[PDB]
Nucleic acid binder design. Structure first.
Ligand SMILES: [Zn+2]
Length: 54
DNA sequence: GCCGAGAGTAC
DNA sequence: GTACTCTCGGC
């Protein structure tokens, strides 16, 4: 079928090896404070490079 | 409307 | 043994 990563099923333990590996992140354009670095990238495409490229 | 975090895998 | 990516839900 498919596989929507549903966090609804029980037994969802929160190991820190998921949030600890990530470290605070700031945007050097609008100083937006993004916690996870992976999200920082997404912030670039939404609040800056979100313009149609060429 | 954007943001914050969970899971599975590979080397 | 760790960090990686994609995905979902919330105020
Ligand atoms: Zn920014």
């Amino acid at each position: 079928p498919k596989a929507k990563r549903a966090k609804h099923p029980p037994g969802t333990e929160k190991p820190r090896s998921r949030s600890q590996s990530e470290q605070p992140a700031t945007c050097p354009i609008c100083y937006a404070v993004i916690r996870q670095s992976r999200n920082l990238r997404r912030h670039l495409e939404l609040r800056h490079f979100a313009k149609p490229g060429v």
